Amino acid sequence: ESSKTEQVTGATGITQSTVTAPLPEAVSSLSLAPTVNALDPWVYLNQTEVPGGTFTVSSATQPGSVLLELEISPELNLYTSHLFRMYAGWSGGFSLKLLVAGNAFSAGKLIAAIIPPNIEVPNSAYLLTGFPHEILDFRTADSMEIIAPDIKNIDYHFRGDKLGKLVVMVYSPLRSTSADFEIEIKLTSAPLPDFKFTMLVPPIQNNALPIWSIPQAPPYSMVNPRSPLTPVVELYINSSYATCNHQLGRYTIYQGAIGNSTFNPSGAWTATCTAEAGSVTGHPNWRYALLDLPDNPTFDPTLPPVPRGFCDWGSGVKSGNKQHLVCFTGKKVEGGFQDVDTHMWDYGDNETVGLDNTYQRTIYIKDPSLEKDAQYLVIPMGVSGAANDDTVQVAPNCYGSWDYAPTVAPPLGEQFVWFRSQLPASKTTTTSGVNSVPVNVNALMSPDLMCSAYASGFPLGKVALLDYVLFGGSVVRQFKLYPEGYMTANTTGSNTGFIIPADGYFRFNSWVSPSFMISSVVDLNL
Amino acid sequence: VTAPLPEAVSSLSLAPTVNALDPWVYLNQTEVPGGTFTVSSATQPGSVLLELEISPELNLYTSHLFRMYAGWSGGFSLKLLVAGNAFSAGKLIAAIIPPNIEVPNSAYLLTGFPHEILDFRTADSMEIIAPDIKNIDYHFRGDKLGKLVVMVYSPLRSTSADFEIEIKLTSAPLPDFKFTMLVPPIQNNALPIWSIPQAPPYSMVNPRSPLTPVVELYINSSYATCNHQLGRYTIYQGAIGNSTFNPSGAWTATCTAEAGSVTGHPNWRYALLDLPDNPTFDPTLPPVPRGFCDWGSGVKSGNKQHLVCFTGKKVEGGFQDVDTHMWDYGDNETVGLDNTYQRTIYIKDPSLEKDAQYLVIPMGVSGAANDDTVQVAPNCYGSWDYAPTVAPPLGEQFVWFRSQLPASKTTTTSGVNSVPVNVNALMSPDLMCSAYASGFPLGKVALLDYVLFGGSVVRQFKLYPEGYMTANTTGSNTGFIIPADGYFRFNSWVSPSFMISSVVDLNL
Amino acid sequence: VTAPLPEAVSSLSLAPTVNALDPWVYLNQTEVPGGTFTVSSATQPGSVLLELEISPELNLYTSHLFRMYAGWSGGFSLKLLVAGNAFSAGKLIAAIIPPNIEVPNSAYLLTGFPHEILDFRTADSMEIIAPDIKNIDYHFRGDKLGKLVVMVYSPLRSTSADFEIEIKLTSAPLPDFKFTMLVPPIQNNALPIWSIPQAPPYSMVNPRSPLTPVVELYINSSYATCNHQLGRYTIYQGAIGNSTFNPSGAWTATCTAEAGSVTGHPNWRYALLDLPDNPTFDPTLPPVPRGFCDWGSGVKSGNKQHLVCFTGKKVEGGFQDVDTHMWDYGDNETVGLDNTYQRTIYIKDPSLEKDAQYLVIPMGVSGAANDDTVQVAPNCYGSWDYAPTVAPPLGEQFVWFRSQLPASKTTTTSGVNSVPVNVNALMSPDLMCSAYASGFPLGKVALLDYVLFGGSVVRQFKLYPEGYMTANTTGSNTGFIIPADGYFRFNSWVSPSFMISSVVDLNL
Structure with a gap:
């Protein structure tokens, strides 16, 4: 517990540097581990930035909002x-x-507390005052230990x-007086003397590392799990897309692949179909088919009803009277060969439901020459002949997959x-139809950039x-x-179909909180 | 004999601070919140009468x-x-786990734990x-924690002469009790005491019939179950089934359909209820507007009850005529039996086809409708999350x-x-509100x-x-009435099997 | 430090027991509940910012x-x-009463009590x-108690752009502080922390239109006062005026017709509302039934905008057609009717009887405005306990x-x-129960x-x-909307002179 005051250059203020211990430390004797392992003395003298330990205070920041929340552990920091x-x-x-x-x-005050x-x-400075706490004034504070x-x-x-926080x-x-003034807060840390480790297990956990290195692989060498046969040619931002209900190209930490996704989307994953004879009332040639379902065929209401990764689609609404998907169909399985x-084609059309929600995922193919019990x-x-860029973006409604990917x-x-x-389009000049x-076609994270994260x-x-x-x-x-996972960037303006090349590469910067504000803006005005 | 297990004392070498207690807290005994139960000759053998965690929640x-x-x-x-x-011949065993x-589920085995035996005739408290x-x-x-x-x-x-014995507990901390790490008092836990407001039930709020007072709290021995989807509230999950809090702001509804008809001496015509939640339009979410209605009109009859409803046509600015x-039940027997006419409904009107949204x-209600028909119970099928019986x-x-x-009577051709x-509630949110x-x-x-x-x-x-109020009765009756004069006073926390001392004689 | 009055230490004899606090409550300073302030250039000299009783409530x-x-x-x-x-420059007084x-209500008399003068330049951490x-x-x-x-x-x-100054107080009991025991933990003291259960406004009843749900939380600066009589609840008294605690059940009413008519259009006849409490035997009790919308019709007629009601005639078992x-209220009588809460009304129905009940x-409403014609309640002349403006x-x-x-339209006979x-209202009863x-x-x-x-x-x-909430705004006063999907979580206690730091820009 101590305090130093220093005079600023051209004396018009002071800087205070304080050391405080709100809660006394209870040093443990470590009598139940007679295997005490000592650190490197120089590690006690190197203060390093804490991951997620930076914040900015502007005139718009409220008291009671929690700016920093960190656990006391070896993860502080490097x-x-x-x-x-x-x-x-x-x-x-x-x-x-x-x-x-x-x-x-300037004017204002910070409060820090140990929990x-x-x-x-809690979400109130009034309540934080009940903890072991310290207060700072913006006019004189430089560092608080x-x-x-x-x-x-x-x-x-x-x-x-x-752990405590x-x-x-x-x-x-x-x-x-200036409307553009902000105060930046930063956190560094080091282990105190009497910090110790215990039993040495030189076997290393594969998830036992701070900062991770991303290989320099540009986006253009990546799927695209929603159009694999076509390469990624750019990144882009659109303001009108404030949600995503996709079931493909959804990868997350702690689970791997979720939804109806997979790590090998190469090609628009093929499938096979066979079902009853019967057609849609809107045309006598819109025949019915049911997607063949390996991987727990028995239609358990908890297993996915579509083949893993097949879910390549657009949408989807009853205006489908003028909109359809286009597929290469082999009309028969004959000793390997197929015509x-x-x-x-499209997903089931029974206006009972605006069917994007088929359970067994009934489809139709608009083919009068289709047999009933054959496999196709x-x-x-x-897609054709729809608008149609914005229709492909919105995925079919999903409740068939019980453990489906959330919006x-x-x-x-x-x-x-x-x-x-x-x-591109596959045009025909000989026969109608x-x-x-x-x-x-857009898509969220691809497996290539997530393997390193895994x-x-x-x-x-x-x-x-x-x-x-x-x-x-x-x-x-x-x-x-x-x-969850996905990428976002701090936009300002209205939609302009903003385009960004795909030849750059990703390099890791610090870890931050989900509420962190990026100090870099993209102007959607162009 | 009073201390089968000694108490070891907590050197407390790792606590950042040791916080003392007021010494007089050690010399006074209070009641244990939730330590009250009853025993009779009808108790089943091997039953665990009381289970109590040993924590600071044993003393006020x-x-x-x-x-x-x-x-x-x-x-x-x-x-x-x-x-x-x-x-009162018999004995009790209290053991530390x-x-x-x-x-285990036998006292013969409980004797293997540090324990104490007690006689049901003893007038002195046992320590x-x-x-x-x-x-x-x-x-x-x-x-x-230990138990x-x-x-x-x-x-x-x-106990040939039937007689129920009531057991209570009191507690005090031992002299070595300590606290540590002062923090602000907000921790997310039930208070040992609710303080109920003295608002009378005359508060005219009834989830299944707003716009009408709540006179005459009553008991009927023939109502042995409750299907009911509206007046259902629990202390741990909130509103259940199709309930609101706020039952009146959800009473009205809208519907739309243009289909032909169904048969019953006049001509009726189907309709579908709007779901502003546009939920998963099959099981996993409710199939009717939240807090709409559940009267219960009877059975496939359909020619005798015909629940009534104010109805109007939707036009710009509001509704007309x-x-x-x-409406609605019940002779759509396929859907009348699947009873998802929870969504699909009738109406005694030919015009409403032009009425695309009403x-x-x-x-x-109407016709040969009793209180017993309104009491039960439009069935529920599927998998939303509907309130159980x-x-x-x-x-x-x-x-x-x-x-x-009251009744609405007419003289014109409307007929x-x-x-x-x-109408019964079953429970009102104006009490669960304070309970929460x-x-x-x-x-x-x-x-x-x-x-x-x-x-x-x-x-x-x-x-x-789970949201019910029960009373201990002795006789048989179908119309026992209690006035709504209106103190609800909290008494204590008891076991679910507790037998109330005060009995209500229904033969008067 | 400064001590205007010496503290005389009491030897607690004969307190039956002297109860100590743990030593760690004396060594840490917490915020004082309610001791927060702002001073601006608009605050007048002699304005009492803080008035604080010296009691155990000064510390958390x-x-x-x-x-x-x-x-x-x-x-x-x-x-x-x-x-x-x-x-900045300025000075405050702190006095012990x-x-x-x-x-006293002047700064000239505060001097005379033991006091201290604090300058904004040096009163930065002052004991x-x-x-x-x-x-x-x-x-x-x-x-x-002293203050x-x-x-x-x-x-x-x-000397430059004007800043506001925010002041807060922390406290700690002196070493001589002690309690005297013992009582159960319900003792009439306001808890320093208020725990509000999460409940969105849309799940709350609107007491001036029970059958319509709440959609917002809007602000309008043209409304500088409120004279309503329905949506009025306080902490000390509960419901005041003609308010429940249940907008729905107390909404409908009955009246007795009278032999008479208004001069303007004889087609509409008088009637007297029925008061089940019969406070016509007593002018000191309300003259209108509890509930019964306090709308909301301005100057009388000539352009004869009126209110609208579903009305019927009483018969056995209920009400006929x-x-x-x-029906708004009498036209041009001396009391301002139709601008006064009264037992006397009229209805536009030539077919009305004399002594019947309706x-x-x-x-x-009809011919009226979607704005401040119904926002203003008629009046509360008399000697009964009406809600103040x-x-x-x-x-x-x-x-x-x-x-x-919504609007009800007709096409056939009524016209x-x-x-x-x-329709807008002050506090809803569902946000005050936990407060009570x-x-x-x-x-x-x-x-x-x-x-x-x-x-x-x-x-x-x-x-x-007193039962109402306010916000700090700046700019124009066009109706400003706010969604109704929040939580209303408790932040702190402040003095009534506190000025909120967050400001709502009414320009959008």
Whole structure:
């Protein structure tokens, strides 16, 4: 506990640097582990930036909103995190330094507090004052050092315990004459003396690493799990797409592939069909078919009803009287050979439901020469004669897949990035019926950029800030990748079909919180 | 003999701070919240009569103080009070179960635990020491704790004269009890005491019949179950079935369809109800507007009841030509049996085909409609999440909120006359509202007093976390009435099997 | 530090017991519940910012503890935190008022009490001692207590752009603080923290239009006052005026016709409302049945916009043919009728009898405005306990719950058509029940947060125990909408002079 005051250059203010210990530390004797493992003395003298330990306070920030929330653990931040790969347990507190870029001609106050394990974090500075806390004034604060203790009832920690937290929040709002003034808060940390490790297990967990390295693979060498035969030619942002109900190209951390997705989408995954004789009332040639379903054929209401990865489609509404999908269909299976052509098709049309929700996924193919109990090969993709770029974007409604992929939306102020590609039209000049039209297809994350994430891993409760480098010029853009997971970037303006090349590459930047505001804007005005 | 297991004391070398207690808290015993139960000769052998975690929730003062703290340590001293008489042969066993040990179902095996035996005739409170069995866990919240278990040892063989014995518990912390880590008091837990407002039930709010008062709280021994989808609220999940909170803002509805007809001496015509939630339009979500209506019109008859409804045509700015018609049941036997006419409905009007979208307001019944038909019970099929049917325990009867629906009579060619009727709730949200702020302790039931004339008459009811009120009755009757004069006073927390002392004689 | 009055330490003899606090409550300073302020250049000298009783409620922990105790003493130490700036100038007074002496209303008289002068330049972290003044050994509950009063001495001015100054108080009990025991934890003290269950506004009833759900939460600056009589609830009294606690069931009414007519159009005849409490024997009781919409018709007629009601005639078992009629209130009588709450009404129905009884249900208006013609209640002349007219403080605007009333159109015989309208109300009863259970600190206001889009930056409102909420706005006054899908989570207690930092821009 101490305080230093310094005079600023050209004396018109002061800077305060304080050391405080709101809660006394209870040092454990470590008598139940006579295998105490010592660290490298220099590791105690290197303060490093905390992942997700940066925030900005503007005049619009409310008190009671939680700006920072961090657990006390070896994950603070760089060298104890790397060292906690060879060991099974740990015990000890941390020195946390809070750096504030204040000025003598502003006003306002911060509050920081320590919260024990299994206690909920409130949303009120009034309530935070009931914890062990410290207050800062923006006119004089430079750095505050907090001796954050290790609150535990055990001799030492294994993995999976509940840990205490440091919470930082605005106590009194910021004011200034200039409307563009903001205060940046940053956090660094180091282990206190008496921090120790326990039993040395040089066998390393494959998810035992801080910052991960992304290989330099440009987007143009990637699927595109919704149009595999076509390559990715650009990224693009559109303001009108505030949701995504796709079932393909949905990959997440902690689960792998979700929805009706797979890691091998090569080609518009083919399928086979066979079902009753019967046609749609809207045309006597719109015959019925049922998708052949391996992989738990028995129609369990909990297993997916469509073949894994086949779900290549557009939409979808009863206006389908003038809109259809286009597929290469082989009309019979005959000792391997199949008579193939192109045909129109779509998901079931029974206005009882505006059918995008077929359970067994009944389809029709618009073919009068179709048999009833024969098997027909079906391979997407095409559309005609619809608008139709915006119709392909909206996927068929899904409740057949019981463990289906949920709809997702970006937070206010952000938009998706939508890996984009083009597919052309297959025109016919001889016989009527089958003429498609060109269309662009978008898609969320692809398996290529996620395999590295699966190998490395993500810290619990944090997203990845990545830099997209596209030289030839000297341009770097910033994206936020969530483990749900998908990419967003901080747009400002109205839709212009914003386009970004696909020859750059992704390089890892710091970890951040889901509410982090990117310090880089894309102007959707062009 | 009073301390089969000694108490080990917590060097407390890892606590950042040790917070002391007011010394007088150690010298005063309070009641244990939820420590009340009953025993009779009808109790089944091997039944666990009481199971209690050993935590700061055993005493009013420690439970109040624990909201300010993050960790605790120490055991308790407990006393059992038994209200028997000289003819009560039998014995009780109280035992301490360590964490991670399963409770057996025979007292012969409970004798293997540190325990104490008791006689049902003893007039002196019996003391036991419930220690804090631990390596660390009990310190923080959400950890595994040792238990106290109370069971019958030698069963009540001499109770030919039926008589129910009531057991209570009191507690006090042991001298080594301590707290740690002062924190603000907000922790998400049921209060040991709700404070119910003194609002009378006369508050004219009835979920199944708004716009009518709630006079005449009544009991009927013939209503042994409750299907009902509207007036259903639970303390842990909120509104269930198709309930709102806010039943009146969801009474109206709209519908639309242009189809031919169905047969019944006049001509009717189908309609479909709008679902502004446009839910999954098959099972997994409700098939009718939230809080619309569930009267219950009877069976396939369809020519005798014909629930009534105000109905109007939708046009720009609102609705036109609002008048009374009939709806919906029940002779669409395919759908009348699948009873998803929850969505599909009738109407006694030929014009409404041109009426592509019309407003509906139930407003009453007609024909040969009784109270018993309105009481039950449009069936529910599929898989939404619909409220299950429920019955009271044997010996108890439901207590309802009752309302009177007057009749609407006409003289013109409309020929649509309603009939006076009565409607039951079953439960009103104006009581669960206050129940929600306090909350219920896990596994317990509220015992409420109902004060009527100054205090000269007091009834006693049991309120379950599933949303029912029950009363202990003796006779048989179909129209027992209780006035709505209106104190609901909280008494205590009791076991679900608790037998109420005050009985309601239905033969008067 | 500064101590205007020395603290006289009491030797607690003979308190039956002397109950100590844990040592860690003395060493940490928490926020004072209700001790928050803003000073701006518009605050006038002599304005009383803070008035705070010196009691266990000055600290967050002692007020929680002061619910299982019966007595206490003595004083506190307060710390002043001021969020000032480089350009401001001004001064405050802090004075200690002994009991049972009255607080003066001028700064010239505050000098004379023990006091301290605080300058905005140097009162940045300042310690004051609030003593416990008494002539007894210890306090019981309900005793007269001394006060701390903070008032503006020299107004706030600045040398550059004008900043507001926010001031907060932290407290800790002095080492001589002690309690006196023992009582159950329900002891009439307002809890320092208010826990509001999550309930969106759309799930709340609108007391001035029960059958229509709430859609918003809108603001309009042309409404500087409210004289309504229905949506009025407070903390101390509960429902006031003609208010429930149940808008729905108390909506309909009955009236008795009279032999007479109005001069203007003889086709509409008088009638007297029926009061089941019969407060015509007594002019000190309300002259209108509880409920019964207090709309909302302006100057009388000539352009004869009226109200609209579903009305019918009483017969055995119910009511015969029911239609829509126009009924607002007498035309040009001396009391302002149709601009006064009265038992006397009229209805446009030549077919009305003399001594018959008629059911009335207000449903809409005709020829009127979708705006401030129904926003104004008629009047409350008399000697009964009517609700007073209220206004927000300067710079603040009311927040209303709002609903849309659709129009009823006709084509055949009535020629009576309604107009689509919007109806707004003050507090709904569903947001006050937890408040009633918990209570408000004396003379304090609740600063609440309205959480809107999953936890974004979101609105802040002030809730006044007189039963209404307000917001801080700037700019134009065109009707401003806010969604109705929030939570209303509790933020803190503030003085009524507090000015909200978050501002609503009424320009969009």
